[PDB]
């Protein structure tokens, strides 16, 4: 499309061009308001619900200045978050880390969005004011003129909610005139009338205003909690006074008062100050109540996810934790539960009712006089506020608060997903217990014990060099059939010879199921035979999670790439590639079809906004890819690594593909970073954003290329700082040739430890480059060890990781006390009954837990191969075994000794009463 060409030609980061609202330069006034506004909403305002501090990497008021700087770099200099986080960290650290910078970037969108609506909405107010001014200058009790405070209310708005309040307010008082205003300006009229327009047609304005406090005055009495404005008192009874407004729509005084009270109730319910003051009070006092429907009482059993909260009474919203509210909305959409959010405590007690919020605020509008004249008005006033609170405000505030509590729970799930992805991408290449990379033999197999085990040998460069099929490696050495043993001996010898012929450094085995443990023991023994014979050095044997490898094998890419290889053997290669470099491997399952979402990050990841989750996951790729750096020559030479170019800061998928395409057309390796400018004609802003993150391995170059090779290209030193990097290297040697000086330091990096960078930072500041302490420390550390991999060194999975990896269970899905279905495998001598779960855990039922009555012979109750319901009592993660019981007293848990912990606010009375 033309847009792809425009993105390629435009000298701006691709993600800046793909942003919903285009990034526009900002004046210092806008940046200062934005910096304070973002700080208030994103960092200073605590979550309504209890949310875990997700900064796996309360920030003070000093953060406001740091945000102003960060916004300056993004909006005026067009630098992406990674560039700022790595090469402008002196200006944003320690208050803002890379995740905080993304948070600021995402909130900049919201600020720009709020300002855009707030500006056009102001234009509407200016047009409306001009139209009313024309009508008045060219008056009935119902003509309210739009004044300077009406404009100021809008200009002071701090959130989309307050903006919506001002908009709802504008529609209530002026919505009826909008079509008249537009036709007068030169369009056909939106026509429906809320009951408020009927009351206006009846002229009730003269009566509604006589209740006393104006909507705004009541708003201040609410805000200040006292009668700051005294209620004007009319000298007549309301029921007698209503006779003056009797018409065809309101034929009786009793009907006139209901109509007029409705008009007053709506004015109060839509006045911005009243909504603002109530919303604040509502978020602080709101209580959540939950009751199960006819369906919920039958379907929400002990195993259902809604078990801990199907009955809630008076739970403060401030006590909901993590994703719990999302689970509540899901159970409600499933029609299992009914949720109710009230500012009042629910109960039938007299004091309970006397203590309600309505009993508190009615006092701010009642006039304290005992005359019948005033008392009957107070009765009307009571019903005027009551209708405003019960019919308009409590329903709307409950919906708005419901959306915020739900949004916080959805955001938690997104943060939990990114936190899991981060923990996967942070793993470094396996290093044997190195310069030519590691030859890896990946071994994949299907869960069916009759399928052949497949091995794939991948060299350190990522090329598949060979493959092997083993029809009997799945058999067990202690089989009752001698034939199995004999046939397996040929495959054992085949693998031993394959290792002998190819000499791989590490063998990875698929975390498919518990049989992977047998495979590792056999592979370790084969390797141990080579070790005892001293025929080959010890070869690592690693259990590697195969979830990513399954997604690979099922991808369109894994078939097209290796058309002749079976699909099971295709998971053997991804397991070999995954241990070589997890980041390059995870980038393979990030296709245009969004295959990434098939990875099980969180049990609720399918219930969050898809676009928000995708952005939150790509941020984890962008964070790690830029920290690690992408070798362009590796990408051109090996199509496998081309997936990382799209995550390089500034490039993206359109420019990333284009970069490889031009180098492909020229058929030349990328020899130096300057070539991005001279051959790809890359503009200064895109070059600035990506140049520090693109690696060029100077050791791979030679011959005529020697004519121009900047050794610094082989490090994260940014080209803008090459002049300083050379000067810093020349001074460490105290030379009175920049390349010769640098080479001596790169080979002998210890000399840089004596160089005092603090003295040099003062000189750069004096020359006008500003504070450079952290940039110089990065350059010095980088020259001390070029491209030092900041990823966490690879480690073998622990007992907890192995158990979860092979059973595909988590502590939340497989907990002590849980009910389960299991198959009987045998009887232990009787000490108990041996069983096997679907997830492969081997369960054991002690004879004392077989039945409520003492059973001496288990054969009297259970048979081998029989399926039996049981309850987990103890879990042994190390042995893959669980102590199960099947006594009816335990199965039904008559003592409630095993059932999951109920919420603190669980309504035990409602649960007992519904029976």
């Amino acid at each position: 499309t033309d847009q792809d060409n425009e993105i390629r030609a435009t000298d701006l980061p691709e993600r800046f061009q793909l942003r919903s609202i285009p990034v526009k330069g900002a004046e210092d006034d806008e940046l200062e308001e934005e910096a304070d506004w973002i700080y208030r909403n994103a960092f200073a305002t605590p979550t309504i619900s209890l949310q875990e501090s997700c900064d796996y990497l309360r920030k003070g008021p000093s953060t406001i200045q740091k945000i102003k700087e960060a916004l300056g770099f993004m909006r005026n200099q067009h630098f992406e978050v990674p560039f700022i986080a790595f090469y402008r960290k002196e200006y944003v650290e320690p208050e803002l880390h890379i995740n905080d910078l993304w948070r600021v970037w995402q909130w900049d969108e919201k600020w720009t969005q709020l300002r855009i609506r707030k500006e056009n909405l102001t234009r509407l107010f200016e047009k409306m004011q001009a139209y009313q001014y024309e009508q008045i200058s060219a008056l009935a009790d119902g003509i309210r003129a739009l004044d300077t405070t009406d404009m100021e209310r809008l200009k002071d708005v701090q959130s989309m909610d307050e903006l919506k309040d001002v908009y709802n307010h504008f529609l209530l008082y002026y919505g009826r005139d909008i079509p008249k205003m537009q036709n007068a300006a030169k369009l056909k009229q939106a026509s429906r009338r809320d009951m408020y327009t009927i009351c206006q047609s009846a002229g009730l304005d003269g009566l509604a205003k006589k209740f006393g406090l104006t909507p705004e005055q009541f708003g201040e009495n609410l805000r200040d909690s006292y009668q700051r404005h005294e209620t004007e008192q009319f000298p007549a009874e309301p029921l007698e006074l209503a006779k003056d407004y009797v018409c065809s729509q309101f034929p009786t005084p009793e009907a006139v008062l209901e109509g007029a009270r409705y008009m007053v109730a709506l004015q109060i319910a839509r006045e911005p100050l009243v909504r603002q003051v109530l919303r604040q009070t509502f978020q602080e006092r709101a209580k959540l109540n939950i009751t199960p429907t006819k369906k919920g009482r039958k379907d929400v059993d002990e195993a259902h996810y809604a078990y801990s909260f199907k009955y809630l009474k008076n739970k403060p919203v401030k006590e909901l934790r993590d994703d719990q509210f999302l689970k509540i909305c899901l159970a409600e959409d499933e029609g299992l539960l009914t949720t109710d959010i009230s500012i009042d405590l629910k109960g039938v007690e007299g004091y309970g009712n006397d203590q309600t919020y309505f009993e508190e605020i009615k006092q701010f509008y009642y006039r304290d006089e005992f005359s019948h004249q005033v008392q009957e008005w107070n009765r009307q006033r009571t019903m005027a506020i009551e209708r405003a609170l019960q019919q308009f405000l409590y329903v709307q505030m409950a919906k708005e608060l419901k959306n915020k509590l739900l949004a916080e729970a959805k955001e938690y799930v997104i943060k939990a997903c990114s936190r899991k992805l981060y923990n996967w991408l942070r793993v470094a290449p396996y290093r044997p217990d190195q310069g030519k990379g590691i030859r890896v033999l990946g071994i994949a197999f299907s869960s069916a014990r009759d399928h052949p085990v497949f091995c794939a040998l991948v060299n350190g460069e990522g090329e598949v060099t060979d493959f092997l099929r083993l029809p009997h490696f799945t058999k067990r050495r202690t089989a009752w059939r001698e034939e199995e043993r004999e046939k397996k001996a040929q495959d054992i010898e085949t693998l031993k010879k394959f290792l002998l012929n190819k000499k791989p450094h590490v063998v990875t085995v698929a975390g498919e199921n518990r049989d992977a443990q047998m495979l590792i023991e056999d592979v370790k023994r084969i390797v141990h035979e080579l070790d005892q014979g001293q025929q080959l050095s010890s070869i690592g044997v690693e259990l590697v999670d195969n979830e990513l490898a399954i997604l690979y094998m099922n991808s369109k890419k894994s078939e097209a790439e290796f058309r002749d290889y079976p699909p099971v053997l295709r998971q053997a290669v991804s397991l070999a590639r995954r241990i070589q470099d997890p980041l390059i491997e995870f980038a393979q399952v990030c296709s245009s079809d969004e295959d990434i979402l098939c990875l099980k990050f969180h049990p609720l990841q399918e219930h969050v906004v898809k676009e928000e989750l995708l952005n939150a996951l790509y941020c984890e790729f962008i964070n790690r890819v830029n920290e690690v750096g992408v070798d362009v020559n590796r990408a051109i030479a090996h199509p496998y690594s081309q997936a990382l170019i799209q995550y390089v800061c500034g490039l993206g998928p359109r420019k990333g593909t284009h970069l490889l395409k031009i180098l492909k057309q020229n058929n030349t390796r990328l020899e130096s970073r300057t070539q991005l400018v001279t051959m790809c004609h890359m503009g200064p802003k895109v070059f600035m954003n990506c140049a520090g993150f693109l690696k060029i391995d100077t050791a791979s170059l030679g011959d005529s290329t020697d004519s121009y090779i900047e050794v610094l290209d082989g490090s994260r030193v940014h080209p803008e700082t090459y002049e300083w990097a050379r000067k810093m290297a020349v001074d460490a040697l105290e030379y009175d040739n920049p390349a010769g000086a640098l080479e001596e330091i790169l080979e002998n990096p210890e000399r840089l430890k004596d160089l005092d960078l603090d003295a040099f930072a003062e000189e750069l500041e004096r020359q006008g480059y500003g504070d450079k302490h952290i940039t110089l420390y990065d350059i010095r550390a980088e020259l001390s060890c070029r491209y030092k991999d900041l990823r966490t060194a690879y480690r073998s999975p622990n007992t907890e990781e192995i158990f979860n990896m092979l059973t595909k269970e988590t502590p939340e899905t497989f907990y002590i006390g849980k009910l389960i279905i299991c198959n009987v495998t045998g009887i232990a001598h009787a000490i108990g009954v041996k069983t096997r779960l679907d997830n492969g855990v081997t369960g054991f039922i002690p004879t004392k837990f077989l039945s409520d009555k003492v059973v001496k012979r288990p054969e009297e109750r259970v048979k081998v191969g029989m399926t039996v319901h049981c309850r987990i009592m103890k879990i042994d993660i190390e042995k893959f075994s669980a102590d199960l019981t099947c006594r009816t007293s335990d199965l039904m848990d008559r003592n409630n000794e095993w059932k999951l912990p109920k919420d603190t606010y669980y309504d035990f009375d409602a649960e007992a009463a519904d029976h």
């Binding site: 430890k753 004596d754 005092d756 960078l757 003295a759």
Partner: peptide, 9 residues
């Protein structure tokens, strides 16, 4: 001309 001091220990 300017030179960074190696005064660091």
């Amino acid at each position: 001309v300017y030179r960074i001091p190696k005064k660091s220990q």
